[PDB]
Symmetry: D3
Subunit: 133 residues, 6 copies
């Protein structure tokens, strides 16, 4: 078993896609271990979540977007959950995300991309600790 | 503008219907204002939630069912949210719930009936205070 | 606990609605106890199935339609399955069938109406004996 | 055999519900006979379309809403199309529209109510002549 | 931004898949700029649309199919819309189109393949001019 | 045309995914030629179906799983049906099955993987003979 950290991003709320995204993960038989709803995540939490991106040109725009509406943070559990949910998520770039994936079917922007999912064992631990101290 | 208290019940987790149910409410344009995930709700919160039923023959079975798996408690907001979400929910009795409703389409038991929704303005305020003190 | 006899009619095959219909019953938590596929049902079984209608003006057209493509016969089991699946099915007359029902959502004709369901305990036993001797 | 005039309203474009609505009518086996896309309908066509309501308190707000985004005008054909599509549409008042209907499932406002459908044979002929001269 | 030309082909109408196809594009957040419904496209227009195929053995059969029922022509707009909608469309050959794509999920023939989408900037301009002079 | 043998496995019944799986194949325009429902398949039939796996460590566990609940066996017909339905099915391994495929969207285990489909012309003939003597 692994646990991974998923964020449902503000664009999912704006576009009424929260259940659609959560449903795709639920239909794959992953179980919710923890879940929190944020009317607006504190900016500092967002900066910590994306600390590895602090020197990128998009960092401030990314943080602005992430505090622009609600987020749901979820810890999902399942065998090899980290890599599996990453494959369901799809690539960041709308020129690459595959039809059938969450981003491939539903996202059309590199930043407004509906969902975060941890990318490794090492980062899942870190991100779960940020959202679920 | 009103707020109402919804519970997604343990049978919805068992049957992987959590997103199906949340999605019916989301598509009606109701907004999540608060939400908590309970791996197992405390017995006392369940008994207070259903205090009106404490002397009924089904009370202990009801409470046992409600602590038999996870629940999600959600506060939804919208114009006339209380009556509107009650109408979406459908009748308790599976002989009465109408096709098109959540229970009419998906529930087949008087107790394992997937969803709670507050039945009035006063009970909404009460139930919101129980789950979101 | 009851068993009822359902027919998926030839129009459902023509319109690729077989799984749509079976899925509405499956989501209501009814269980398949028996099922047979008929590439073309024998005329005699159809005439016995609809024996009550043998002197009606529409009888020959009804029987011709019923042998015009495949049918699936299914026995479903569940608490009060007979009445519950009748309610899912919807009224025969397309001017009456309610949205949310199988016929209300999907059927637009009094004869090409997608689904048969037994109407009573005695007719269920009779119809089950016809299709599953 | 009848023809009826449907408008997909600006809120359906805003909420990405255009195909959801058209699909409910398509699944009922109604056929498109004519269809036009309006990036913004002319104010005069809207006022003629809703001429019966010209002296009502909500008329200006109604017309403003109707020119606030795109509309699709569609002529649908089928047996008793007028009454049948009215039944699919659902009651104007969100306190009354039934789950299973388009408005009952998806609309939450008396004005932003997603779909227009002709209410009678004579109004269908009138409305078809307005949108498809 | 780019604009691309999409055709919903006659097999989509025969199989009641119009809304399903349009919905997949709508859920990806592309916007309709122009749309026309054709009860039957003129053969000459089809020959112009597929002028590059005039020497292929399938040309006449392709033109016959394209005039065999209705078409909807749509101009969609979005960032990199041309390549993105091509990826949603899927490969022409049913041995290759990927599950998750429109053709991969829904088409089972090289010619009756539900949807056209422009393949380049150069051809989008040309095709938009054909369908929307 | 080819005919291929599909099994809907016991986990599909446990998880109420029978219609979901059958629907994906039906939407691709494959036709049912034969179908049988098994309340519980005889173990010997399962051992014959998987005879090529008799020396693998998972063989007994695989046979136990296959008799743990109902199966539906279906013969589907269509051009290149064998390879096409294999591509819809997706890879056995949940680390590899692609989003958009049946297993990629819905299965999370190497053994509880919802669906069997014949892998070649040679094995389809053999498997059809086992389930449909
Ligand atoms: C690469 C990239 C990322 N971002 C934002 C959106 C990404 O979800 C977030 C983190 O990037 P990254 O970790 O590369 O992507 P993913 O979300 O697929 O794991 O940064 C941009 O805004 N612009 C960019 O060019
Ligand atoms: C009336 C009734 C309720 N219950 C349980 C299931 C109900 O969801 C719960 C509360 O009853 P109630 O408030 O009547 O129903 P609803 O949930 O529709 O508002 O009690 C039974 O188990 N048996 C019964 O006969
Ligand atoms: C009443 C009626 C039925 N039929 C056909 C279609 C019905 O499914 C079938 C049996 O009629 P009935 O038992 O009245 O309907 P249901 O199928 O709703 O139980 O007869 C007609 O063709 N015309 C009619 O006027
Ligand atoms: C009755 C009513 C209608 N309207 C608007 C929305 C309605 O779609 C439109 C026409 O009214 P009406 O013809 O009564 O409704 P319907 O659309 O159900 O046929 O006028 C209001 O804004 N407020 C109102 O109180
Ligand atoms: C290649 C090919 C195309 N066609 C038809 C169907 C195609 O949609 C149309 C144009 O071909 P093409 O431009 O290759 O495909 P696409 O539609 O994927 O851009 O020609 C055939 O009928 N047979 C064939 O072998
Ligand atoms: C390879 C493998 C198969 N199996 C079971 C599940 C497979 O569906 C079945 C037959 O294997 P195989 O023919 O390799 O897979 P497929 O079902 O994709 O054609 O054996 C295991 O239980 N464990 C394993 O490691
Ligand atoms: Mg990342
Ligand atoms: Mg109550
Ligand atoms: Mg009857
Ligand atoms: Mg009106
Ligand atoms: Mg091309
Ligand atoms: Mg195999």
């Amino acid at each position: 078993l692994q646990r991974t950290l998923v964020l449902i991003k503000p664009d999912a709320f704006e576009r009424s896609l929260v259940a659609e995204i959560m449903g795709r993960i639920e239909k794959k038989n992953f179980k919710i271990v923890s879940m929190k709803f944020w009317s607006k995540a504190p900016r500092n939490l967002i900066e910590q979540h994306y600390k590895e991106h602090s020197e990128q040109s998009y960092f401030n725009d990314l943080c602005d977007f992430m505090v622009s509406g609600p987020i749901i943070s979820i810890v999902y559990e399942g065998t090899d959950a980290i890599s599996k949910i990453r494959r369901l998520q799809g690539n960041t770039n709308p020129l690459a995300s595959a039809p059938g994936t969450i981003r491939g079917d539903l996202a059309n922007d590199i930043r407004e991309n509906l969902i975060h999912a941890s990318d490794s064992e090492d980062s899942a631990v870190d991100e779960i600790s940020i959202w679920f101290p």
